[PDB]
Amino acid sequence: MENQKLIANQFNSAIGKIQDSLSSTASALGKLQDVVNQNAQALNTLVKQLLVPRISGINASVVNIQKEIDRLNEVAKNLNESLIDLQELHH
Amino acid sequence: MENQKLIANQFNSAIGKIQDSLSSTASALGKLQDVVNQNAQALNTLVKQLLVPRISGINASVVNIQKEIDRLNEVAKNLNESLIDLQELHH
Amino acid sequence: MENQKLIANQFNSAIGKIQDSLSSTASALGKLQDVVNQNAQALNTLVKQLLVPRISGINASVVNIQKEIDRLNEVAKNLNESLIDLQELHH
């Protein structure tokens, strides 16, 4: 094929794979954020239940990486605008 | 150098760096998954050991992002198929 | 525009978005590492405070993914060296 079509097709192929990787990274980060926060709640509930009638300074922290997860999903979508339209490679 | 060789070389350079980043992301996610699950087990063991003879509703969750980690490693490898073979830029 | 300029501009656009995604991934991983380790410390402090005068084998693990986070930030920066300089597309 024409050199420019080989280049454009290989680029578009790579972008599609990178798009998949961004969605996978965002999904994994969201699941980690959910479990970390659930387990922080469990630990804080344990401290409270040990203290309430039928260790006071111990507090589990929560995580919020939602802006980062949303950005990854945004980039995965907007990379469509960086794909090369082969019909625009004039001849 | 020829314009197409500059483009192809810069593309191939970027893909190699992105490949490294995918492997690093997958490694980091795996280590987080391991520690999160180890600490969930530790918390659940604490609740159990406080209750067994020498807080019942408290349960730490586990995380499984293995499909996402495997996909990142898969993309890092398969991006090799998106590299531009310079020998195929005919003259 | 010229086909090579379309290709080079689309490539440079994609790299910039991928750079943003790497910085976001590194930021999210750092926040998860911080909270996971803070909550490991909280759990270990709980075990200790239950045992000290006014469950011994229970120990929360810590995570260290700093090499991976640093690599992601390094790639996000060094991808600048993979951008195509349009002034070098001679005519």
Author numbering:
A (entry chain A), B (entry chain A), C (entry chain A): 917 to 970, 1169 to 1205
Show the paper's wording.
We first positioned the HR sequences of HCoV-19 to residues E918-L966 for the HR1 region and residues D1163-L1203 for the HR2 region, using the SARS-CoV and MERS-CoV sequences as references. Recombinant proteins of fusion core, which consists HR1 and HR2 linked with a peptide linker, were expressed in E. coli cells and set up for crystal screening. The structure of fusion core of HCoV-19 was determined at a resolution of 1.5 Å. The HR1 folds into a long α-helix while HR2 exhibits an extended structure from I1169 to Q1180 and folds into a canonical α-helical structure for the rest part. HR2 interacts with HR1 in an antiparallel manner. A trimeric structure of typical coiled-coil could be observed by simple symmetry operations with each HR1/HR2 complex in a crystallographic asymmetric unit. Detailed analysis of the interaction between HR1 and HR2 revealed that multiple hydrogen bond interactions were formed between amino acids from HR1 (N925, Q935, Q949, N953, N960) and amino acids from HR2 (A1174, V1177, I1179, Q1180, A1190, N1194, I1198). The results indicate that an obvious hydrophobic face could be observed in the contacting face with the other two HR hairpins in the trimer. Therefore, the formation of trimeric HR hairpin was mainly mediated by hydrophobic contacts involving residues from both HR1 and HR2. Overall, the structure of HR1 and HR2 complex of HCoV-19 resembles those of SARS-CoV and MERS-CoV, with root mean square deviation (RMSD) of ∼0.918 Å for 73 Cα atoms (superimposed with SARS-CoV) and ∼0.881 Å for 70 Cα atoms (superimposed with MERS-CoV).
